[PDB]
Design a protein around this nucleic acid. Structure first.
Length: 79
RNA sequence: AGAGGCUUGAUAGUACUACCGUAAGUACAUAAUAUACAGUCCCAGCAGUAGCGGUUAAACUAUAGAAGAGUCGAGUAUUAUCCAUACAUACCAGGCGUAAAAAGCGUUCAUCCAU
């Protein structure tokens, strides 16, 4: 997407993968907790636990875009 | 008529707790009618969504118009009020083709649903 900016059709495809990966973490967290922490350290992915339902407020809800905060420093938050 | 207020053009099934065809104010006296008739004639009026009134229609006024043809009755009737009678106030018990009603196409939060 950086080199090609007129390809608006693939913009919708990226969202599908981002949401799909989020659901994977939820399932793996309940079946194996020790393994969930080990995989995050190797890939340097922000580990997040799923123990309570997420609130409806956007100022404190989860954000699948900023999952890889360590690897990406320009897609964390804004005003 | 021991006694008054309504209707007198069509339309309305006119209430239901016992009895549920298992019986007479049954017959004589004791049988009749009002879509007969009178006044005005798009003028005066009545009425209920629909309407009538010009040449005379049971639709307007009038019952010494005949001991009024009817329903109530010591009351009757108009307006007003509510969850306004299945105009279903819609779980029981209405919809989303043409008729009033499905967001331009899609991934996500919460809730609900699933084997």
């Amino acid at each position: 997407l950086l080199r090609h900016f007129r390809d608006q059709q693939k913009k919708k495809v990226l969202s599908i993968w981002l949401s799909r990966r989020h659901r994977v973490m939820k399932y793996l967290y309940r079946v194996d907790f020790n393994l969930y922490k080990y995989v995050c350290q190797q890939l340097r992915i922000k580990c997040v636990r799923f123990a309570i339902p997420d609130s409806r407020d956007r100022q404190r809800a989860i954000s699948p875009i900023a999952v890889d905060g360590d690897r990406c420093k320009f897609l964390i938050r804004q005003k």
